[PDB]
Amino acid sequence: LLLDPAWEKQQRKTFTAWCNSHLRKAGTQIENIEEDFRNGLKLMLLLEVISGERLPKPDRGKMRFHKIANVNKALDYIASKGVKLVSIGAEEIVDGNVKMTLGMIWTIILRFAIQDISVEETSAKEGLLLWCQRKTAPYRNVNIQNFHTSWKDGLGLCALIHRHRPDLIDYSKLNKDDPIGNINLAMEIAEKHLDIPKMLDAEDIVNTPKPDERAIMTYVSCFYHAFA
Amino acid sequence: SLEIEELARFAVDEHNKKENALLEFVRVVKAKEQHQFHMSWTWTMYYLTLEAKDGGKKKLYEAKVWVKHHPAYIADINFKELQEFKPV
Asked: Which member of A170, A174, A188 has the closest CB to residue B79?
């Protein structure tokens, strides 16, 4: 794959894993993000888990209009949290519009995992980037400039771990020559020790000239919340 | 050695956690190893045939256990994953 489909594969993997990192707390999972939010049930549950708030009763009815009602409850809830929904409609989610479903899940990740970040009076995506730059500043083999190419060799992720948890990782053993191995190391440590499920495909990140920045921001936001 | 036995015990404990089971490890019957060496990562895939008691009844199981080592990982000896656990 290249360009839009390559980024779609990355968003599908990472956004599915992020949703599952929350849904596990409610005793469930999704598998296929193009299918498993169409009825609105696990979308409403995801919003309850990440917000700690109660949404209206889900409708388990099998008809398209029941599912549109559920997705509208989800979208009404998201709008109530100050989110301006552009080019998102309940019918298109229920009808399995993959790009709109991914866009909706991104809007949820941004609102509930990134927007309220505040670092040195810098908010949201820019605050998260500033945090990453501050934490990795002394690691000369890291240069965080963005949420895409700066993360491809795995050293930024490994440096975030070393910076906070030097009991887990000997950063001195790492270099840029094994980007796939480095990403896998960060993900294996974070899954076992930081309760952050693996959300990237290391081969896909390393082999794409510019990886998907929404997927990378999603995963990096989990390190921010683990270490905050 | 202790290590093949330790991995078979890990397999039974992981199966017990995953399947809400109470299998009691008896012994390793046999082990096959497959090795890979990447730059820093080194991997062994263990194909373990083991005996365990299912309500006191001794039964044979095959467990697939993946053991991954990286020299930068210092919190534990390695990463271990049960991939498969089935009666044979």
From this structure: A188
Strand (E) or helix (H) holding B85: strand B79-87
Closest CA to B45 of B18, B69, B19: B69
Determination technique for this PDB entry? X-ray
Instruction: Output phi, psi for B82, to 5 deg.
Output: -80, 115
Asked if residue A199 and residue A127 are part of one domain, the reply reads: yes
In whole angstroms, give the CA distance from residue A70 to residue A58: 6
In angstroms, what is the resolution?
1.2
Element (H, E) at A79: helix A64-80
My answer on whether A217 and A159 are in the same domain is yes
State the angle between helix axes of A3-23 and A98-109 in degrees (0 to 180), rounded to the nearest 10. 50
CB-based contact (8 Å) between A185 and chain B?
yes
Of A86, A117, A148, the position where a domain reaches its end is A117
At A205, is the secondary structure helix, strand, or coil? helix
Contact A23, A29 (CB under 8 A): yes
A37 neighbors A30 (Cβ within 8 angstroms): yes
From B72's Cα to the closest Cα of chain A, the distance in A is: 5
C-alpha to C-alpha distance for A78 and A144, rounded to whole angstroms: 31
Q: Which of A167, A171, A178 sits opposite B75 (nearest CB)?
A: A167
Q: What is the total count of domains within chain A? A: 2
